[PDB]
Amino acid sequence: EEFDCHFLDEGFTAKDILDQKINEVSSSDDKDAFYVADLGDILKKHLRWLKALPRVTPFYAVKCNDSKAIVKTLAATGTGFDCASKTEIQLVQSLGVPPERIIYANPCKQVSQIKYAANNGVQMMTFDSEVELMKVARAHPKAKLVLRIATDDSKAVCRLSVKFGATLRTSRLLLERAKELNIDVVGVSFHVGSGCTDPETFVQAISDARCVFDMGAEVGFSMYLLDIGGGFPGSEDVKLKFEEITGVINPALDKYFPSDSGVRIIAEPGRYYVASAFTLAVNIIAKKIVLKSEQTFMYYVNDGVYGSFNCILYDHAHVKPLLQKRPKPDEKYYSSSIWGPTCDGLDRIVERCDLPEMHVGDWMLFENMGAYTVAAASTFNGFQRPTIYYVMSGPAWQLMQQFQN
Amino acid sequence: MNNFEEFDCHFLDEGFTAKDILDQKINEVSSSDDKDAFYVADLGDILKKHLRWLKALPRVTPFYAVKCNDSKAIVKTLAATGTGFDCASKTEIQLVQSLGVPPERIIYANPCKQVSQIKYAANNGVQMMTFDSEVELMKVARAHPKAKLVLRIATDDSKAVCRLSVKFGATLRTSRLLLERAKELNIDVVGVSFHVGSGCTDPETFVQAISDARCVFDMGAEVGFSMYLLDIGGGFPGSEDVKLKFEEITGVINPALDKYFPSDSGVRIIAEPGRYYVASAFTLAVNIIAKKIVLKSEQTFMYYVNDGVYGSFNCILYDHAHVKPLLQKRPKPDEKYYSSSIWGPTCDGLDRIVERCDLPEMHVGDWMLFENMGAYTVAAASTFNGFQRPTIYYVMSGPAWQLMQQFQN
Numbered sequence: 001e002e003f004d005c006h007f008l009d010e011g012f013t014a015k016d017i018l019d020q021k022i023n024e025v026s027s028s029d030d031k032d033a034f035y036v037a038d039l040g041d042i043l044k045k046h047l048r049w050l051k052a053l054p055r056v057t058p059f060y061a062v063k064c065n066d067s068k069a070i071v072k073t074l075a076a077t078g079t080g081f082d083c084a085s086k087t088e089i090q091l092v093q094s095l096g097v098p099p100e101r102i103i104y105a106n107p108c109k110q111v112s113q114i115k116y117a118a119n120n121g122v123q124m125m126t127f128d129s130e131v132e133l134m135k136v137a138r139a140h141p142k143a144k145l146v147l148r149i150a151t152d153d154s155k156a157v158c159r160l161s162v163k164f165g166a167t168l169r170t171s172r173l174l175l176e177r178a179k180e181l182n183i184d185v186v187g188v189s190f191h192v193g194s195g196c197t198d199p200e201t202f203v204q205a206i207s208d209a210r211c212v213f214d215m216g217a218e219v220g221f222s223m224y225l226l227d228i229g230g231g232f233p234g235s236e237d238v239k240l241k242f243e244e245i246t247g248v249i250n251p252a253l254d255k256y257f258p259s260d261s262g263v264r265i266i267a268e269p270g271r272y273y274v275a276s277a278f279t280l281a282v283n284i285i286a287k288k289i290v291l292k293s294e295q296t297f298m299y300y301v302n303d304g305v306y307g308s309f310n311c312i313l314y315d316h317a318h319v320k321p322l323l324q325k326r327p328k329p330d331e332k333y334y335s336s337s338i339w340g341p342t343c344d345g346l347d348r349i350v351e352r353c354d355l356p357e358m359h360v361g362d363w364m365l366f367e368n369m370g371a372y373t374v375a376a377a378s379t380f381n382g383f384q385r386p387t388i389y390y391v392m393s394g395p396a397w398q399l400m401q402q403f404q405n
Numbered sequence: 406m407n408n409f410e411e412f413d414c415h416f417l418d419e420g421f422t423a424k425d426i427l428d429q430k431i432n433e434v435s436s437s438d439d440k441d442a443f444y445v446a447d448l449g450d451i452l453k454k455h456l457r458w459l460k461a462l463p464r465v466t467p468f469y470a471v472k473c474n475d476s477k478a479i480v481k482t483l484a485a486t487g488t489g490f491d492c493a494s495k496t497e498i499q500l501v502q503s504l505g506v507p508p509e510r511i512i513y514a515n516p517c518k519q520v521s522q523i524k525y526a527a528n529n530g531v532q533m534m535t536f537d538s539e540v541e542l543m544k545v546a547r548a549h550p551k552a553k554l555v556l557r558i559a560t561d562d563s564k565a566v567c568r569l570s571v572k573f574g575a576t577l578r579t580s581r582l583l584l585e586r587a588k589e590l591n592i593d594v595v596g597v598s599f600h601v602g603s604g605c606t607d608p609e610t611f612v613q614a615i616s617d618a619r620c621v622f623d624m625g626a627e628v629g630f631s632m633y634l635l636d637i638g639g640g641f642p643g644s645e646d647v648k649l650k651f652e653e654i655t656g657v658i659n660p661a662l663d664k665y666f667p668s669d670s671g672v673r674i675i676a677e678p679g680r681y682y683v684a685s686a687f688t689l690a691v692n693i694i695a696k697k698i699v700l701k702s703e704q705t706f707m708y709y710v711n712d713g714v715y716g717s718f719n720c721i722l723y724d725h726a727h728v729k730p731l732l733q734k735r736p737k738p739d740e741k742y743y744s745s746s747i748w749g750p751t752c753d754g755l756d757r758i759v760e761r762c763d764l765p766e767m768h769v770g771d772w773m774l775f776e777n778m779g780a781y782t783v784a785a786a787s788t789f790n791g792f793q794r795p796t797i798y799y800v801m802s803g804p805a806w807q808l809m810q811q812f813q814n
């Protein structure tokens with residue numbers, strides 16, 4: 001099923017295919033959860049990106065969703081790839097992507113994995129520490145290093161212990177140390193984060209990147225690569241929309257990294273490309289009614305926080321259950337909870353929402369489930385991952401062909 | 406020590422512990438390039454746990470909670486030992502049966518089961534299933550009408566580390582209705598189960614739960630059921646590194662069982678221990694793959710290791726685990742210690758294993774050990790960011806294998 005793709009007829013959307021599949025399973029017993037993945041939506045996101053950020057080459061963050069069909073489509077489109085490990089490099093290269101379209105954007109890499117990158121010609125890596133410089137000097141000495149600088153996320157849960165990113169003070173020492181060890185530093189990267197509330201953060205980061213560029217010029221480096229990272233939204237169901245962010249980013253890029261300077265600008269978008277392309281259908285497998293006389297309901301579905309909905313814990317996701325069958329306007333709603341299939345009491349998807357009374361065998365839909373869902377799912381309790389059905393229309397395939405030409 | 410892994414088992418020589426095997430493996434890869442994280446799993450420790458259970462709960466037949474750690478070697482060892490198996494899904498039943506366990510040693514103890522999975526259980530002769538709701542009775546009537554149902558009742562698990570009663574368990578009031586409804590539908594109810602909560606803190610919960618079970622048994626007698634099966638669940642600790650030790654709990658359980666369910670009554674008592682059997686059997690070794698020095702002049706350190714909260718240390722989030730990093734060489738008393746944090750390998754900023762602990766200054770290539778990592782660790786790990794599951798090295802001494810032979814006879 002991984003390399004299986006289905007045709008999407010004219011005048012049909014992913015929602016229609018979802019509905020169709022549901023209605024054909026009504027008689028049968030087998031009602032496992034499943035995804036519909038529209039690869040056309042990914043081509044749409046690429047066009048949108050080419051329009052909004054024409055100076056910025058996108059490098060897809062594979063960790064977001066490592067589905068071979070996703071990476072194959074993006075590779076045909078001509079995007080780069082951000083890989084964080086040996087396995088992701090193997091995946092991307094197995095699909096025929098050359099090393100110069102891969103950035104190894106993990107600042108803290110196991111020596112053996114750095115060695116693997118060196119053996120397969122992946123030259124560009126990020127770093128933010130001296131120990132990383134020593135490891136690179138011993139294990140991949142001809143590497144092109146990108147210094148990752150810190151960004152301020154005022155909304156982060158742990159503000160005093162940031163995992164990644166060098167301060168400006170530390171950046172100067174890192175550049176001088178890299179000069180000592182005869183290691184080539186070719187640019188700067190930063191990551192604003194997914195939970196960005198104010199686009200001005202990007203401007204500050206770009207300004208900071210410029211500052212580090214100047215330091216590199218002082219130490220004797222020929223800096224050309226600016227990596228503005230990821231964190232762009234993957235659906236329209238957010239307060240801060242993609243185009244607002246890009247409208248703030250482009251003037252900053254023109255001001256601080258003008259095209260005549262010879263700078264090459266890239267980004268590492270993960271969720272932007274895939275979030276909205278995947279829709280999840282889960283089946284209500286069990287039901288309890290609790291009287292409070294106000295009726296309330298507990299619904300158990302066949303995916304949970306150990307599966308696709310791990311994003312509730314790891315990605316701070318807020319999931320919105322949608323009904324497959326549109327409800328009548330006068331239908332009565334009830335206070336309801338939604339639970340996953342496992343034995344664990346913390347396997348709860350929705351604490352409290354308003355739903356009409358539903359029945360075992362009814363379906364619930366979750367949109368915008370492409371990013372950091374299947375990539376981090378486990379088989380706790382023995383429950384297997386939902387099948388993914390890939391779809392693509394004819395015109396979407398034509399568009400992909402145009403990109404290949 | 407190099408594997409051939411699932412069914413590979415290494416000899417543990419006399420006078421050698423799992424710790425010694427760890428040392429040997431570490432010193433063996435000293436100059437080598439590849440220092441991936443790995444487990445040492447002592448199947449001897451699982452056999453010792455079984456012997457300890459037989460001594461402490463002689464009336465209670467243990468049914469291993471496969472979901473806790475579904476490694477084939479553990480299930481195979483426990484099956485040779487003669488334990489039962491608590492399975493939560495079709496896949497776990499397939500695993501247990503594939504290792505040759507007959508269905509009468511399997512309880513399907515998931516109270517809210519997908520219809521197709523109930524059907525699978527019926528198709529493979531797994532008769533005994535738990536339930537706590539009317540809709541479950543409807544599904545059973547339709548998909549497994551000859552099933553032997555066990556009513557799961559609620560418990561006061563407020564002091565337990567992992568509360569399960571919010572999600573599962575019928576009140577006594579509801580239990581009366583469930584038994585009457587089951588009678589209407591001509592479904593056989595044969596007993597009661599409960600779960601005190603994983604990581605029990607107060608053994609008195611068991612006493613109340615046992616009492617509650619007695620009442621539901623009596624309710625069944627009123628409606629015409631011949632109840633014989635009492636299932637006292639799990640929640641037992643898996644290491645000695647806990648305030649509430651196994652033998653205190655069993656000392657509270659046994660009198661209650663004698664009072665409410667005397668042996669002459671013909672009751673059959675089982676339990677569903679998960680972490681008790683496997684927690685201390687697994688020790689995890691991780692390598693320090695990266696290092697940062699942060700000046701405060703007070704020096705602090707940030708260590709990055711090659712397993713994290715998406716892998717084995719998911720137990721930090723899901724299992725409320727508190728992990729203690731251990732050094733391979735126990736440190737000298739005069740060595741200087743530093744405030745330190747430990748981080749996983751992934752790009753995620755939330756991938757932090759230890760916020761603050763005191764460690765001597767360590768270096769890339771040094772190892773850290775985590776004991777008691779057998780329960781709810783590997784079973785719920787993912788390959789996020791492409792980082793692979795740690796290799797498991799199974800070891801067993803000769804005497805341990807002899808003990809397993811005695812159990813198998």
Ligand SMILES: Cc1ncc(COP(=O)(O)O)c(CNOCCCN)c1O
Pocket residue numbers: 061064082105191193194229230231232268269270271272314315371372752753754
């Ligand atoms: C260095 C880096 N580059 C890209 C991304 C992807 O960001 P996205 O566009 O998906 O927001 C990341 C992601 N890092 O953490 C994501 C954690 C989500 N649970 C990078 O680190």
Ligand SMILES: Cc1ncc(COP(=O)(O)O)c(CNOCCCN)c1O
Pocket residue numbers: 343344345470473491514567569600602603604638639640641677678679680681723724781
């Ligand atoms: C129904 C059931 N039976 C046994 C167990 C295991 O209990 P243990 O002996 O391991 O404490 C469970 C566990 N349920 O949830 C555990 C989630 C732990 N993160 C059952 O549900």
